[PDB]
Paper text:
To gain insights into the structural basis for the selective inhibition of [name] by [name], the high-resolution structure of the [name]:[name] complex was determined through MX. A general overview of the crystal structure reveals that four [name] molecules are bound to the [name] tetramer, which is in accordance with the stoichiometry in solution, previously determined via analytical gel filtration. Interestingly, the epitope of a single [name] spans a region across two [name] subunits linked together along the AA’ dimer interface. While CDR3 contacts residues from both subunits, CDR1 and CDR2 each exclusively interact with amino acids from the A’ and A subunit domains, respectively. Interactions are also provided by the flexible [name] B domain, although these could not be observed in all copies of the asymmetric unit as not all B domains could be built due to lack of electron density. A comparison of the conformation of [name]-bound [name] to the enzyme’s R state structure and an inspection of the tell-tale features of T and R state trypanosomatid PYK conformations show that the enzyme resides in its inactive T state when interacting with [name] (the signature Arg311 flip is displayed in Figure 3C). A first finding that supports this idea is that the [name] epitope is significantly distorted when [name] transitions from the T to the R state (Cα RMSD of 3.70 Å). Based on the [name]:[name] crystal structure, we hypothesised that [name] inhibits [name] activity by selectively binding and stabilizing the enzyme’s inactive T state. Since the [name] epitope is located relatively far away from both active and effector sites (∼20 and ∼40 Å, respectively), it seems highly unlikely that the observed ‘slow-binding inhibition’ kinetics are the result of a direct competition between [name] and substrates and/or effectors. In other words, the binding of [name] to this AA’ intersubunit site is proposed to prevent [name] from ‘rocking and locking’ into its active R state conformation.
Residue numbers in the entry:
A (entry chain G): 1 to 130
B (entry chain A): 2 to 500
C (entry chain B): 2 to 90, 187 to 501
D (entry chain C): 2 to 499, 515
Write the structure that this text describes.
Amino acid sequence: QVQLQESGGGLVQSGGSLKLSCAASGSNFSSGRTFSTDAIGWFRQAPGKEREFVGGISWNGGITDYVDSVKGRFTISRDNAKNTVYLQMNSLQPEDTAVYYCAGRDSWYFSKVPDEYRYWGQGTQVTVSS
Amino acid sequence: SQLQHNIGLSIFEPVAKHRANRIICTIGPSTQSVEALKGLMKSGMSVARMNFSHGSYEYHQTTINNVRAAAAELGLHIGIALDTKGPEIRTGLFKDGEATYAPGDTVLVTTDPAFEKIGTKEKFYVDYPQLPNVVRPGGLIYVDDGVLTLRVLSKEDDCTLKCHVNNHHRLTDRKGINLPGCEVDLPAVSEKDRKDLQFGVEQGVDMIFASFIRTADQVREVRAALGEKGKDTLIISKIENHQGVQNIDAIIEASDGIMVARGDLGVEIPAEKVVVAQMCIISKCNVAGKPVICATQMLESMTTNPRPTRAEVTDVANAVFNGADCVMLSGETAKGKYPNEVVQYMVRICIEAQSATHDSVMFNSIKNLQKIPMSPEEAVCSSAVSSAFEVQAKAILVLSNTGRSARLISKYRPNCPIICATTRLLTCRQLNVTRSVESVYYDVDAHGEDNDREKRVQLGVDWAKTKGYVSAGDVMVIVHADHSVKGYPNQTRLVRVRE
Amino acid sequence: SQLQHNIGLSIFEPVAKHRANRIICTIGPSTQSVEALKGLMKSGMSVARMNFSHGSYEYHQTTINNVRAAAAELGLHIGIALDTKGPEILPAVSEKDRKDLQFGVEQGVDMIFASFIRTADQVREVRAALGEKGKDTLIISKIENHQGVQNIDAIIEASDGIMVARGDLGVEIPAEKVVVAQMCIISKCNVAGKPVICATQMLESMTTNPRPTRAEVTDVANAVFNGADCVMLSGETAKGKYPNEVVQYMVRICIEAQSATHDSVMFNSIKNLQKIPMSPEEAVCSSAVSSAFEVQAKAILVLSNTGRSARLISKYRPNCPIICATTRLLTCRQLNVTRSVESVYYDVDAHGEDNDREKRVQLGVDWAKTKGYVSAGDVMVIVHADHSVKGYPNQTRLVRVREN
Amino acid sequence: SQLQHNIGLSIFEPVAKHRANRIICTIGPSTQSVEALKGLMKSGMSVARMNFSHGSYEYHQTTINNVRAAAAELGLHIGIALDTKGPEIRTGLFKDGEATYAPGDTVLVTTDPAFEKIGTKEKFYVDYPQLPNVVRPGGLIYVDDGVLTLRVLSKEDDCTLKCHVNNHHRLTDRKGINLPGCEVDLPAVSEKDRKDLQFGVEQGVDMIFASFIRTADQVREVRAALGEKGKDTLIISKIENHQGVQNIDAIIEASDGIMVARGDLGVEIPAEKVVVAQMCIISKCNVAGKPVICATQMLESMTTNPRPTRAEVTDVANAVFNGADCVMLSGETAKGKYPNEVVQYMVRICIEAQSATHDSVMFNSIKNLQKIPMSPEEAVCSSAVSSAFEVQAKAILVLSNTGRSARLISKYRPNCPIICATTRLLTCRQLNVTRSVESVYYDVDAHGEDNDREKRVQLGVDWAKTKGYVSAGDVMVIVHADHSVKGYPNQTRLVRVRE
């Protein structure tokens, strides 16, 4: 129903920083939900692994949460007027190398559980080389 | 019980209900283009309301044409409704659009058509030609919903009066006059009203929202005006003064449905009462198995702001909880900066309340009022909803060509979608105001005749499977007419969807 | 059934029911005067709220003395509540909160409105702060964010009451969700038999206009239908231009909603949720309300000192007023926050010890007689404890009021 | 509520119920004539019982042939049942028809196959051959129904035992003996049983009353004993000892029906408990939807007097109130002076007690036992009965080929007649043992194929019209299968009779 469109992966230097962006179109007309109604999660899947919670943001931006690994380094924010979610990554280290996804849940509140999200971005590669 | 249900609710679990309630959207400057109407249909509209208290037959022909077009593009069947202007001592067309009145001021109140638009802070026009002969010096004139009262001082001329302004007020063009003394003897249908109704019958509208309905005789007059060319169009009585509340039982019996016009009601009755009045009118409508619609004052503020007040949202949710089949927007979608968004909020509110209501309570309540022995027809629909609950059916499929059966099933208020397979497009269009119902058209000419009722059943089940209602192994409930009934459906079938 | 009740409602019949819901008023510039306080009290207020987010210790001492004075003049027991400041713009008890809470305990406030309550641990920190001098004061936990709703069950077991700050909730969660959250929390409290209050966004437009909007009015009515014990005014009575008319408006809405609700649904719902060996306390209470329905009593007189019984009878939502004859004045004041209860005070020192339990009963019947509830010939349900039981009500009498 | 019903009863009002319970008559000397049988059928017999405890294949062949001829004359379908002799010790035959004993006598009990017809006060024969090897000195041997007790004193020969009589009781002939001593190794189906079962199968009986059923595995042994030719014949397990009550759940599951033999039961268990066991067994059968029959001690005094006792009448009435499907007459109809009269009394008691029962209690109690999500099959049957109640239907008409549906509708215990239209005469005959059902036969070969299921419905409606059940204007509930599936009925219609 809602579709997400990612942008912003690449290669970066240990300690550098990137900005991941996710842009949203469409609606679940059945429910009346749009990007602006839906909480957004960011997850990462490192090579060979499953896909783990990184951070999440409620529908209107009033609540966020982060895994400890990235607290103080990562910042999730959102602009509902531009239908966009952002994941700002600072002091990147080799352990953040992975593919990164945004996903949208049909709830005002976010989850750390991947199966609880309804729509996904298609994923972007982030590689931190020192 | 609601109590047990309520203590089980969670703000954190997504809801899962297929929306039962229906949304009526008024059309105007923000939503008359075909692209607009398409986004309104995508974002929840079931009926397009044409508000005839303004605009020309050209403006409304554009709406009719454009909605039939957007619908076609989308393959939907959208109801069109005509809201009558209605008997109303009215007044407007103020020079520059407006006039401001201060207390102590004196103003000319005229029934001369020469000032019909050149209405200024000194002389304006009132549409009733018998006003000088009915209001005497001393009594008042309630202008714009009892907000601006005038005290008559003299019959200045043959058809003008000089009056004393009580309170300050900003009077915009075309505001209603509400002469407190009665003996006005207002008709059921102005001469404009009548003409408009022939225009509607001529263009094929599906329902009339008849305005300011006070007695049952007047609903009958509306019917008469619609003629035989439109003996089949729904009449939805607009209850907007205390007379209509008073005679709600007669009116309900003579109408096809009811609209509760809360803000009009609010000028004659106090708000704490209007609440009660809505509970009574909706519930009577429920019991009668007639559509009832909540209208005036819904997400009003969302006409200009991107989100409503919580107060307003609870207001809508209350209408649903109370029993309403439909909610109507009026200007939120006509002149509003957020038409689609307001429709989608209505969708979210409807599903939340629906998920928040104990699914069985209304069924059990309606059933307990039913006198015994029930008719066959009544019993067929009652026990179809009952069988649904009992086998946890996921859809009821009723084959009805007029829509009666689907309305009777919706009265028993099942907890699943009702799918109506009909042979008539008018029935698709008109079912848009009946809770839980979705229609499916079988063009007999372009296919078989389906005497064995089998491709129509397939059409229904196919719809349910593609719309996510039902899957392989789910149970469904089929209600239809047998080979041998004068009319009405008397057969029911409990089927399982096959892979 | 509610459906059947609705279909026979009429907007034209005068409604006749004794207001069971309670109104809390916040005090500020428009209402601190003793005369103005008297006017609030006559026009339906039962508890005075002190907002410790603004105002000095001297300023609230002023309001405490003034309400005590105006109440004394009218012969009423009005409660006083201290609304904590909270950790606003994380801990549970700010240092300021600690000093405010001891000020309230030393000055004799009846209840705390603990702000920003998220876990049950924090409400217990508040109870610790209250100390032994405030061992018996009500802790009303204010739910104003998502952790509050998530943990509502623990918070309810630890609190004496709950308050739904719907405006505060609306900042983190969408409005339709606030609607659902309010129903959840009210009814969880209803089952728990603890008072629940609705707080923000009530008749806010009446702060400056002489009448509110119809949407506002149905929002209040919908709190009442949802099950709330009390509604609370905020700026309406503190800064507002029409404090007396808005309290009266709350009274008319409360009565109309009460008369529009079906009298037995609550009782049947609460009762059927009970487990099949009931305890004798719970049994006496439910069956009193039940007996009241079966005999159409116009009053239930309960003899509680702590008010426990009165709360328990209230949980079963009877048709008629509940008169509590108590000997502790703080119970008179705290009971103003429970639905349908009205306390009558019996001074055990100034009047002979009512060891028989018989003069308190008469006191109650006389109160019910004068208020207008009961008239010679009417039945009443009397609920108290016997000469020898372990500190709870266990017997129930059914009385026909006689000319006296 | 039964209380509410009770206090409204009147002894002076004529009853107007259609008899729903069914009557089984055993056939013997008073009734084996074709004319006698026609009179029993007119009088209300539904199943003719053959006690294979006595009688030759030539005799029972005659009973079989006569009941078919009599039914053919009356245009009826009567079920024939075969009651096994069973694994029950029997006491040879006694010369001059009788012989009496006094306590302190000494009598020989031999198993030498001789003396089988001689049988004197001094020495008589018994069925068990290893009786000399099992019952040891002092052992207690109970004859008739425990009435006589004997103590084993002497060893005598390999064939004979000398026993002390501890009585005062006169024996009648070929009586049974139930010795309490264990090491009996009771069979399930004796060689005599087996050949009798084949005779029944080969001659086409409708049902087996299996005697002395103790375990479920016994019921399976009986099933096995009927070969592919006898897979359609019902087995009704006769519960007549404490083990029978002990295993009633397994035995109900394994059987097609149960017969409560209360006399046989009273020999091992105290009366008071038999009363209770009867309530228990009957009710478990109701909940399982399988027929249950009450059989012994019915109107026994009517074998020789033209009036039963009041306690006997209440005993019958109690069985009906209790929930019994059928009541069964034994000697009263086989060797009795008043066969037609006692059948007519059974008809009268049934009607009276059915009419004093509260119409709705059983439907509600069974429905509340049902786990929710119901099967479609179960939903269809229960819902047809509740439909009948709500429309005050005068008949349910079900189209069932095996009759499974008709039994499932009867389980919900409606208050009107059930008409089952079948294409199988075996089904017409076997449904004679379920409450409220009446079969109508459709000869596929004689008429069309009724693919539409229309001729049959007509047959049913026609029948209920001629029967006196329905008139033009009344409502009927019709349950059948749709033309897209097979196996079980899943479709229902509510029809007003026209004429």
